[PDB]
Structure 1
Amino acid sequence: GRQKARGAATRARQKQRASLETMDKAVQRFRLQNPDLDSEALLTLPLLQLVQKLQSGELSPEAVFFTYLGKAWEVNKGTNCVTSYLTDCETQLSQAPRQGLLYGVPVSLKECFSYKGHDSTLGLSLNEGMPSESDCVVVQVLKLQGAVPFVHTNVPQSMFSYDCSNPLFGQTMNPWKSSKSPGGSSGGEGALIGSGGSPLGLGTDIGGSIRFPSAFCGICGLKPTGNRLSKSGLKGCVYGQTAVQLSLGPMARDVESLALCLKALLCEHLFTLDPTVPPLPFREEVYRSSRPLRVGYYETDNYTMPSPAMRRALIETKQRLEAAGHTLIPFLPNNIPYALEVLSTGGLFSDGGRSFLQNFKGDFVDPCLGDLILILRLPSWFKRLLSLLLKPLFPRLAAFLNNMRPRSAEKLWKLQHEIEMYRQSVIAQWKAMNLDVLLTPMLGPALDLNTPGRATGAVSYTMLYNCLDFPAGVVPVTTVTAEDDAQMELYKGYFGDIWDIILKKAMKNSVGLPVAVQCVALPWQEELCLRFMREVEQLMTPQKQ
């Protein structure tokens, strides 16, 4: 019963196509009137220098806007990362506030950041032809700070994924290798920023969806504490689920860009437009501190075996931090399996997936979601039974199935308390070793297209910090060598289940692809997190600063 959804696809693709044409026509007009502009030099300027030149008058907003608009159009050709051109953004451009900290900066938005007059489909038929009545709060703040949001970027269908394909706009590709995923669900942002088509973007993250795309596409990303920024006006699939919180945050080519973005967002405009966000301004002096850090670290979470490239990235960064004078302390959060199998899965699937499934009624199911929908559709008893059969041979799979069952409000309260007491556990663990920050591996290199949805285990590295609601960011530190990739033939994985087997195959043939580490601080500590990220960036890739 899918013809209605075929109509949605046809209409969505027409709007995407017309958006692209509108963009190109404006780019072609602009270039004719400005034939001598050094567009390469403008595009490769770091955000901090770009901002300064816009503030001084050295570069016109128009010059910067249309150049990035040109570049976004071009990189889209090989990645399919842009779903929509934000129609009024040229008239926004001419009205941008001069004193704004982001005056004249083109910014790209993940499709779920509602923008007036435009759909936030999430790749779902039922959200097509349902344009937002207004800009969401962070989009309002961006504009009040002088920025110019200019495109919506692609997401995997429903966002419940770390790949990036849906049936309306299709499949987004990694800009480093087109057989590879850009990661997700902020994958359009990853591909666009990662190929130079936007200097700053916003994404969201409930199990790693800022961090996967950033890592897979070789850019920086930060997932703040859930309630550091406003979620007001965000489009979603499931509403009212508060056990594992959603976070939104910046993506960019460097760390300084992330810190600029958070500084611009954490202002009175935000705090008055959404009073439910604690009014905590950006603390520059914590961000800029150069005091030695106590850095906890691990090479593996003992759940998802790291690739050789991940492991090399982690050890090398550790050794450089030591040489720079920081104290590196072996540290692994306790009971990760519990945090993932019981707390995180149970938090996301407390209703057995029912609320989530209503979004898919009458719709196609994108191949990049794997068997997720099929598995969620199954009866609560046949899940339970299959869980008991799989437990001897495949304990991970069994635990997954058993913890995605529907349960009562009573049981949800108990789960919510366990999440709270686990949070306090890890905090106490952290304080007993007197850590400032924590260094971890990050999933990478980029997986093959249509494999993330079959490698669910691999979310272990990022999902843990959604469960704990700790700020976490990722920084590119190296690229896959011939040796790293060859050494994947010796990868086994701790479990030997289908998730380990898919991941092994998924990560092969990745020579030249970027690989990241993850940086973590305690709740409300975004500034310390970024300081630390800045340090990693400086030591492993000094040409960024």
Structure 2
Amino acid sequence: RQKARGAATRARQKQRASLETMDKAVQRFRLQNPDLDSEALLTLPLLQLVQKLQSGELSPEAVFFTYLGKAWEVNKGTNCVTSYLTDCETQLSQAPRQGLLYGVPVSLKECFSYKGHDSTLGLSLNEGMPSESDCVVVQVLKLQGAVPFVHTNVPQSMLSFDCSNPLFGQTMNPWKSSKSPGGSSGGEGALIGSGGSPLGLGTDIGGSIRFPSAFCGICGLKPTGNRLSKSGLKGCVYGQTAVQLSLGPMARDVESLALCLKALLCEHLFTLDPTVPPLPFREEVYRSSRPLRVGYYETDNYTMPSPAMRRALIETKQRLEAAGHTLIPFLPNNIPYALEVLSAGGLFSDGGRSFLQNFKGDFVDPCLGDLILILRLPSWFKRLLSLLLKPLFPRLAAFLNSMRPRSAEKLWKLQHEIEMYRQSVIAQWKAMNLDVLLTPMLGPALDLNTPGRATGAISYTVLYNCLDFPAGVVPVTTVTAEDDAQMELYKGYFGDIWDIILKKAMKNSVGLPVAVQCVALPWQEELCLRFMREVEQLMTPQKQ
């Protein structure tokens, strides 16, 4: 463990120097610009902020250092920032004036490769291996006048919806220090959620944009896998295509997500990565005020919603009805199958071998729970345990069996079943003539170190990675003391360890944000955002 300790010492020194540099830069600017109303600057919605930047009312310098100062401050309570992207102060002066994001500071999840910086993923083997170019989406952000300013924290190896690693440590929810910020885009959740960044980028293969957005009370969108460029993204495993990885915006309101999506969906992106279909942002779809046919469920019969989740869902259902929309009961078929064999088997087709190679000689962060221990088990023993667990705890047994290695032949079979399943859900959708789908979103935030032990609770998010449908979340309410007290009546549908842990983990959540999930068909990001906009306007009208 000498190698791993050395990596942790190096990374913490780098993080400390980053924060110091940040601190000195903001102190210098504040003293040189004492009359600047920093509070008003920071409370500006992004759209108003960009219009002031475009007109020249606010300088890019003013916006930048004010946000840097705020980022530095919120980090003290959250530990969300791993790295200051030092060269940003010169990109600031060079920002293209006609750019749609001119002078907008943007936070980046650590896996977004940035020249001269590590993308560690909390892994020793990636420490001291800086990237030698910006990833594609970073290049286009810069060409649109945006200024990426920080790298934000992720759970070790990024397969966790908590947010801790042995290198930069544990990220905390800004609303409550004992709560997880979610993950794997947890640092983004904490930074944006506390006001330290107006716009961020995250990734999602099982919920990693949506979890931290919901837990930290911000908006996030997970597009169709290939709507945006993955070129230059750092990951633990490459070449897994059964369950689609996506990247997308995270922000304080829906309009910010739409703006970022529009800015990204430009000639620069389509030229820099020709593999991405050149689908322009269709403004006509996003701005539509036509009444919607909205499918909805208030439970997936897999993860029992918290009282706060259920109320959030019913209330927005009611408000959408009152607004003239048609609400139709709808549940994607065969959810247990889609999670237990398709999703779990898609993510772990090789039994976790590729994934495990990253952990050789490294600490295993507590927030990952028993994942690594389980994956290390021999395939015969996984099968054996699965057979024994099945009569008593079928959820655990199904996952365990699906986390075994298989042949290329069996992968083809799985990929085909994923295609057929996607077809089946599309057919259901069509048969009910839906435009859109409203679902619950896992919340309120779980206690630190519990997401790793409540695996079933990914049911609400991972389904739409498997299906590869655009899915976003919007904050709609907060946990009342009434909601929180009702957790004592929560039993889950199965009563296995996942239910038991989840019950405990969702307690003590008064005042915490609670979200709802919005889904559309593949390539319909604009329609998904149109529906997110509607939810936002109805449930939280002050946001618009």
Residue 397 of structure 1: how far off its partner (Å): 0.4
Residue 396 of structure 1: how far off its partner (Å): 0.3
Say how many residue pairs are matched.
Answer: 544
Measured in 1, the distance between the counterparts of 2:269 and 2:431 equals 36
Please identify runs of 4+ aligned residues in structure 1 that moved more than 6 A.
Answer: none
Write out per-residue CA displacement over residues 299-345 of structure 1, whole angstroms, 9 at most, x where no aligned residue. Answer: 00000000000000000000000000000000000000010000000
Measured in 1, the distance between the counterparts of 2:86 and 2:175 equals 29
Write out per-residue CA displacement over residues 173-223 of structure 1, whole angstroms, 9 at most, x where no aligned residue. Answer: 000000000000000000000000000000000000000000000000000
Measured in 2, the distance between the counterparts of 1:542 and 1:313 equals 15
- What secondary structure does 1:412 align onto? helix
Measured in 2, the distance between the counterparts of 1:62 and 1:242 equals 42
- What secondary structure does 1:150 align onto? strand
Write out per-residue CA displacement over residues 32-60 of structure 1, whole angstroms, 9 at most, x where no aligned residue. Answer: 00011000000000000000000000000
Measured in 2, the distance between the counterparts of 1:81 and 1:9 equals 16
Measured in 1, the distance between the counterparts of 2:58 and 2:432 equals 49
Aligned to 1:394: 393
Write out per-residue CA displacement over residues 260-291 of structure 1, whole angstroms, 9 at most, x where no aligned residue. Answer: 00000000000000000000010001000000
Measured in 1, the distance between the counterparts of 2:524 and 2:248 equals 14
- What secondary structure does 1:230 align onto? coil
Write out per-residue CA displacement over residues 339-372 of structure 1, whole angstroms, 9 at most, x where no aligned residue. Answer: 0000000000000000000000000000000000
Measured in 2, the distance between the counterparts of 1:86 and 1:339 equals 40
Measured in 1, the distance between the counterparts of 2:51 and 2:11 equals 38
Write out per-residue CA displacement over residues 409-445 of structure 1, whole angstroms, 9 at most, x where no aligned residue. Answer: 0000000000000000000000000000000000000
Aligned to 1:366: 365
Residue 88 of structure 1: how far off its partner (Å): 0.3
Q: Percent identity?
A: 99
Measured in 2, the distance between the counterparts of 1:410 and 1:494 equals 35
- What secondary structure does 1:359 align onto? helix
Residue 245 of structure 1: how far off its partner (Å): 1.0
Measured in 1, the distance between the counterparts of 2:18 and 2:314 equals 45
Residue 399 of structure 1: how far off its partner (Å): 0.2
Residue 115 of structure 1: how far off its partner (Å): 0.1
- What secondary structure does 1:300 align onto? coil
Measured in 1, the distance between the counterparts of 2:103 and 2:243 equals 35
- What secondary structure does 2:359 align onto? coil
Q: TM-score, normalised by structure 2?
A: 1.00
Measured in 1, the distance between the counterparts of 2:17 and 2:64 equals 19
- What secondary structure does 2:476 align onto? strand
Measured in 2, the distance between the counterparts of 1:329 and 1:58 equals 47
Measured in 2, the distance between the counterparts of 1:498 and 1:380 equals 23
Residue 452 of structure 1: how far off its partner (Å): 0.1
Residue 450 of structure 1: how far off its partner (Å): 0.2
- What secondary structure does 2:130 align onto? coil
Measured in 1, the distance between the counterparts of 2:502 and 2:63 equals 41
Q: Is residue 300 of structure 1 aligned with residue 299 of structure 2?
A: yes
Measured in 2, the distance between the counterparts of 1:239 and 1:466 equals 16
Aligned to 2:222: 223
Residue 87 of structure 1: how far off its partner (Å): 1.1
Aligned to 1:430: 429
Aligned to 1:417: 416
Measured in 1, the distance between the counterparts of 2:39 and 2:59 equals 15
Measured in 2, the distance between the counterparts of 1:223 and 1:490 equals 33
- What secondary structure does 1:90 align onto? helix
Aligned to 1:209: 208
Measured in 2, the distance between the counterparts of 1:220 and 1:35 equals 32
Write out per-residue CA displacement over residues 127-166 of structure 1, whole angstroms, 9 at most, x where no aligned residue. Answer: 0000001000000000000000000000000000000000
Measured in 2, the distance between the counterparts of 1:130 and 1:124 equals 11
Query: Which stretches in structure 1 are left out of the alignment for 5+ residues?
Result: none
Write out per-residue CA displacement over residues 54-98 of structure 1, whole angstroms, 9 at most, x where no aligned residue. Answer: 000000000000000000000000000000000100000000000
Write out per-residue CA displacement over residues 242-273 of structure 1, whole angstroms, 9 at most, x where no aligned residue. Answer: 00010000000000000000000000000000
Question: RMSD of the TM alignment (CA)?
Answer: 0.3
User: 5 Å matches for 1:113-512?
Assistant: 113-512=112-511
Measured in 1, the distance between the counterparts of 2:26 and 2:405 equals 52
Aligned to 2:4: 5
- What secondary structure does 1:152 align onto? strand
Measured in 2, the distance between the counterparts of 1:305 and 1:66 equals 44
Measured in 2, the distance between the counterparts of 1:44 and 1:324 equals 29
Measured in 2, the distance between the counterparts of 1:98 and 1:448 equals 44
Measured in 1, the distance between the counterparts of 2:197 and 2:417 equals 41
Measured in 2, the distance between the counterparts of 1:453 and 1:499 equals 10
Measured in 2, the distance between the counterparts of 1:104 and 1:165 equals 31
- What secondary structure does 1:334 align onto? coil
Residue 120 of structure 1: how far off its partner (Å): 0.1
Measured in 1, the distance between the counterparts of 2:95 and 2:476 equals 35
